[PDB]
A paper describes a structure:
The RNA genome sizes of LSV1 and LSV2 are ~5.6 kb, encoding three major genes: the Orf1 with the unclear function, RdRP responsible for viral RNA replication, and the capsid protein (CP) for the host recognition and viral capsid assembly. We determine cryo-EM structures of T = 4 and T = 3 capsids of virus-like particles (VLPs) of Lake Sinai virus (LSV) 2 and delta-N48 LSV1, belonging to tetraviruses, at resolutions of 2.3–2.6 Å in various pH environments. Analyses of these capsid structures reveal the intermolecular interactions that drive subunits assembly into homo-trimeric capsomeres and eventually into a complete viral capsid in which specific domains, such as the N-terminal domain, the helical domain, and the β-barrel domain/C-arm, could encapsidate nucleic acids.
The models of T = 4 and T = 3 LSV2 VLPs were built and refined with the homo-trimeric subunits A/B/C or D/D/D. Each icosahedral asymmetric unit (iASU) of the T = 4 particle consists of four subunits A, B, C, and D, whereas one iASU of the T = 3 particle comprises A, B, and C subunits with the C/C dimer taking up a position similar to the C/D dimer of T = 4 particles. Accordingly, the T = 4 LSV2 VLP is an icosahedral symmetrical sphere consisting of 240 copies of the 57-kDa full-length CP with 80 apparent trimeric spikes on the VLP surface, whereas the T = 3 LSV2 VLP is composed of 180 copies with 60 trimeric spikes. Besides the overall differences in VLP diameters and CP numbers, the local difference in T = 4 and T = 3 architectures is that the icosahedral 2-fold (I2) axes in T = 4 particles exist between subunits B, C, and D in two sets in the quasi six-fold (Q6) arrangement but I2 axes in T = 3 particles are present along the C/C homo-dimeric capsomeres. As a result, the T = 4 and T = 3 particle sizes of LSV2 VLP are variable, with diameters ranging from 494 to 482 Å and 450 to 438 Å, respectively, from alkaline (pH 8.5) to acidic (pH 6.5) conditions. In comparison to the expanded T = 4 and T = 3 particles at the neutral or basic pH condition, measurements of diameters of the shaped holes on the I5 and I2 axes of the unexpanded particles at pH 6.5 show that the minimum and maximum displacements were changed from ~5 to 4 Å and from ~22 to 15.5 Å, respectively.
Author numbering:
A (entry chain C), B (entry chain A), C (entry chain B): 66 to 513
D (entry chain A), E (entry chain B): 417 to 513
F (entry chain A): 313 to 416
Write the structure that this text describes.
């Protein structure tokens, strides 16, 4: 009839993963009564303009050969460094490869992605170059942008030796800095559910064509193996790549965060469902689900055009992972950034495991199978009204917890004992104008 | 603690889409806080016995050639027109292609469907003929029945330029008429959840068989490519085609509607779940999931029979669409109808969009992110006791809303303020006998 | 505001299927308002050490030929009968093939399973032999263990003629006996959710290699059909076969049941979710989802290694069924059993159907569409704290129902009228030590 | 009703509600002798049936009666041809329903 | 606003809220004649607008008035060049916002 | 089109007939002098003309709509609605008694 302490702690870490108060770590409030190990991964990366030595090419040049460093086309990228740039991070729900960084010479019209599968995508300290025309880059081309993945190795090691898993919470912080007189820029951030699924695209086999005109060999096997089959199953994400542009996100989502670049960002990525069931580790090739080109049987056609129906283009990422379902996909855009910037990324991912016997996790188990429905209902109610992001320095929210959670816990059904906790009003997060008010109208000091 | 006005309006349009009071249009009560555009499509079609000029054939005759009109086999169909006929409409949850009409010379034993993929299925003003033996019809055969799809083009155009969608409500009205002294007939209607899914049937590749008996060419590539792979993914509907016959539906479902033909029908198709999450547009080839023929590994067998396990026959419809999940499939049967009938179909589909930037929908957005749990709980409670269909002239239900919704909104949990609203009793919808009573025992005037 | 009688009866049969009081049969408390037929299958099997006449071999020997009896290698299995043995039952959620029995000469390190698809798996009265090295057994090999499936034929016949189904409850009882002075042994039991899914593994096609060196035939079709496609869809179960060993289950699950062998066991397998929606019959080849061997694109690689990513080994079972989703998988281990034992298995499966018209079920329909949310919430709350198994003779629990259900029904939300029912404490099920206490601290008489 | 044979199909659809009632059987005896032989096809859900007719008649059997008087019972007139039909308590019926 | 043509795109985005109001139209007439022609680009979300200006003016039309007095209305002085701007109720405005 | 566009639109079975009291669209009804003129129905334009960047040579042929002359002259009552009905699916041997009342 009242929220427990464990449920409240879980709610606090789920809504504010990077909060200074969230020192202890607690599991999902369903009391699964299973030996579980809750792991907390905190990582920091100082990303800046990459040097030439950590910059590989994805074209057919590095096809069978391992990664090829740029053959001193780095002059063009220095030319980029002359002017202002744009920096995007895409936080897909992938467990490892927490975020994908991308550097552009100037703001793109849309989040384009290469059709051909890239060669050797690079973990963060290295990058991989893509051409201006949306194609893989070989040496002697026109560089279009740089891309890299931020990889957590310990997450891989632990997901290896685990019977099941579920991601408890994840937050990303973006402490931004630049030399004085070069702080100009804007930061935009937005979350949105991009629910992927295990799908297989429709492909075609190759018909065999043999002409036996041997004197006694005249079989003439001309059979058509050119039928339609299914490619290997891949986890496809329906991220609206054509609408990941900054203005699109701003006008489409009203919880979208906007500020000057120096404020950084802080995205506590949130769920999109009520329940968080355990899942077995299941790494799969990730792909981004593009737009279809052949309508096919969307219009009156014959059987000959039955097969080539509405087949969407699939962009292979050449990256394999098991994703956390039902979590939002986040994305920011640091547009108009000085080239000699410095971004301190700080990611905190806390997630639960069912340890495998004899594995490492078996020595760090925790038996606190607490049950709580009030906390889950409150999480459902808040998910739909919490801001998408915050300034990087914004933590330890006074309204959070003793005020917001208490004021909202009275609403669920009539599971309420305290008559009234506190009236709740619509906040106004005008970070650009310094006219920000919290959920109870109390003005916030933008300095803190 | 009380249902809002927006939640009540949504409930009203969800339960009574064709209601005269439902003039305003409102979105789903979850307050998604996303720019949304709610579109209302109202369409009217005067379907009657088709003339010869709008009647194409689906056999191999129209395989590569476009649609072939019937080569004056129309004499047999006139022979149909001599006697009474039967008319079925199948309202699958497909977004476009709202319903599928079908004309039979006499009542079929079951909803048979052709095994071979038909050639050029026809939008409504045209029809396509199928043979009596359940096969595609070429000219010079025995016509078995006529089939057509009712297509909404604006729905296609809007679903093209939309990031996400969800179907808010859908209703179909069947105003029936016939010349005086020819009103004889019966109408049956029934809804039932036929939850389709993206599945791929198991098919076989073609083994290559080459006999190199050339003097120096003697490789003899005899490798068996005859392995088992997956066909292209299709959205399959498990509609019990063998049990879509009228009597089957009547005896199986107790909410099934029955009346004399002149009364028409009015089906407000209902959901089958609590939540209605947004989905990205995803047109796929629709198929109807038949019955399996080879048991395969359902019995002790070897590996040679491991592959050909329980593979069900799949009936390709040669029609592509993205379906609204979790909504019921409706079906009626106008049996014993005079051949020179006239049915005015009136479909109203209201559904929500997340507009794509620059698209048309972006100019017609609506920001009313209202939240309501009472309305959703009431919808869950009602879905399970609302009649499947109504007489065509039955609208503006007095019991609906101020009485039924109020009387039921007290039940959910104990989220109740008013002590008692009104006792609720089991209605008796005896439309044939003119002894109909509503949810509170008040007799209804069958005239209105 | 209070649990109904039908909801309470459903809860009782769901928690205690083999309870003597559960004579009447009741459906799921959601009031689906559909004609339903609830079927109860009670089966008894006296399993013992099989004789030579009912013992077939799974190797390539019985590949095209039907089952081959053992060619008097039965001497080795008699040698097994000299010493103590181990007996496992695996209760997967398969509707038919309720359990899978397995006999070992001595306790295995893990639940190994053959990589090659076995030949003709045997229904219970017959068994099938597997080699010691984890391979299929042909005559003249070293027998490793025996395996069989317990098959319910009536379930097959009824699932054939049914539009939809859902499994209401299932219980398995293990009355154990042995000659006097041979009762030594231990019994372990455990349930755990192993949520399977329809998956297709990634396989490769065979590239065609033709060398036309005919004088005029020099086409030289060398095209590579060796691409990557998807195998047929199979229902894969992620059962942690490497951790189905007894000690693993004991230390991993704290609700795991342990006792001396003579006590038998009684597993009321439980759900893992709140809702139990109807599903259409959908038999599929079952498979057990092993462990992957090729990391593939889990590490930086090229496109040539993109395809062969993290592909897990799949163990085909050569058995087809449609499984009940969201139910736990149970497993016991009778370790250190005398060879001349005798186990009376008693399985009770009660499950709901939507009858097909004209089918047999249509004559045994039941219209009691009762609705109850309190019962479902109570079931959710109990699922997480009920013991996994019981001694075979333990039924008719006093704490169950009038005490446990009443004491717990006050917790859900504040849907509570009676102020306090009874305090609830943590039970201690120390069946080995005869110090067992129920949910209210009342000591239980191990004799009853 | 059936008594299922073991192993037969009926054995999976059994029902244990062995309720006993003599009042219902006596009422059935009393009604059998005064119920109309047939009805118009559309005539169902009789208002007089059950809460009225069965209650009004259940007081008669012997003196197995608790409620003093339920409702007076009169002879109905089923003149379906003439549209002058009256039920067991004189209430005119709408031939449409 | 549009009156959609049948079958056209607008037909899928219609809105039925035929609200009637004469007070709003009269207030619009009264304000049109005294509202400033333009504003600084950053000037939005006027505090005086709506709850204050519209309320204070809605009492004037005829005597269609329930609230006795809302707020006295004075002539504003929009001296944007000199940073001496005052709104319709004399409250100085911060030129920064 | 009329049914879905107008919510005050009347629909019924044919036997019910109809009764349209055509209404004004304005507040005032000032007197006007008789002024018969050729009536025409204003169709849809075909030549965009200066709706797009063009020269003077295409300045003249701007957005000129097709006009359908009715070859009928009258003076119309301004500000009154235009009514329209449709008796669809009528038996050929029907009989419609029109009764018009105009007071002016």
């Amino acid at each position: 009839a009242v929220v427990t302490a464990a449920g409240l702690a879980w709610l606090r870490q789920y809504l504010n993963p990077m909060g200074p108060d969230t020192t202890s770590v607690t599991g999902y409030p369903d009391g699964s009564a299973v030996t579980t190990c809750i792991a907390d991964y905190s990582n920091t990366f100082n990303v800046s303009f990459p040097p030439r030595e950590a910059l590989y090419c994805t074209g057919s040049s590095s096809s069978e050969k391992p990664t090829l460093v740029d053959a001193d086309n780095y002059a063009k990228i220095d030319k980029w460094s002359n002017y202002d740039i744009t920096l995007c991070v895409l936080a897909l729900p992938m467990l490892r490869n927490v975020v994908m960084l991308r550097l552009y010479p100037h703001t793109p019209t849309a989040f384009a992605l290469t059709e051909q599968t890239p060669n050797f995508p690079q973990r963060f300290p290295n990058w991989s170059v893509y051409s201006a025309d949306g194609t893989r880059f070989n040496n002697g081309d026109e560089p279009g942008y740089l891309q890299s993945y931020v990889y957590l190795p310990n997450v891989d090691k632990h997901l290896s030796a685990a019977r099941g898993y579920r991601l408890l919470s994840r937050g990303i912080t973006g402490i931004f800095s630049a030399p004085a007189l070069e702080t100009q820029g804007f930061v935009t951030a937005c979350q949105y559910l991009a629910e992927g699924s295990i799908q297989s695209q429709s492909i075609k086999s190759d018909a065999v064509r043999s002409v036996t005109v041997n004197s006694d060999g005249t079989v003439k096997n001309v059979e058509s193996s050119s039928q339609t089959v299914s490619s290997m199953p891949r986890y496809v994400f329906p991220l609206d790549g054509d609408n990941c542009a900054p203005s699109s996100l701003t006008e489409t989502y009203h919880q979208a965060y906007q500020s000057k670049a120096t404020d950084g960002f802080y995205m506590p990525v949130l769920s999109s469902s009520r329940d968080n069931p355990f899942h077995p580790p299941q790494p799969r090739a990730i792909a981004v689900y593009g737009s279809f080109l052949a309508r096919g049987c969307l219009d009156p056609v014959s059987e000959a055009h039955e097969a080539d129906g509405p087949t969407h283009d699939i962009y292979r990422l050449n990256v394999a992972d098991d994703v956390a379902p039902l979590f939002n996909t986040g994305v920011v855009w640091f547009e108009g950034i000085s080239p000699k910037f410095s971004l301190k990324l700080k990611t905190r991912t806390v997630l639960q495991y069912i340890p495998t016997s004899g594995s490492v996790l078996a020595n760090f188990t925790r038996h606190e199978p607490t049950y709580d429905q009030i906390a889950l209902d409150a999480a459902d109610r808040l998910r739909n009204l919490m801001p998408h992001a915050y300034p990087a320095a914004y933590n330890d929210w006074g309204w959070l917890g003793d005020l917001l959670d208490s004021a909202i816990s009275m609403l669920p059904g009539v599971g309420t004992v305290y008559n009234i906790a506190k009236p709740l009003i619509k906040p106004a997060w005008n970070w650009l104008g310094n006219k920000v008010s919290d959920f109870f109208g109390n003005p916030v000091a933008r300095d803190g």
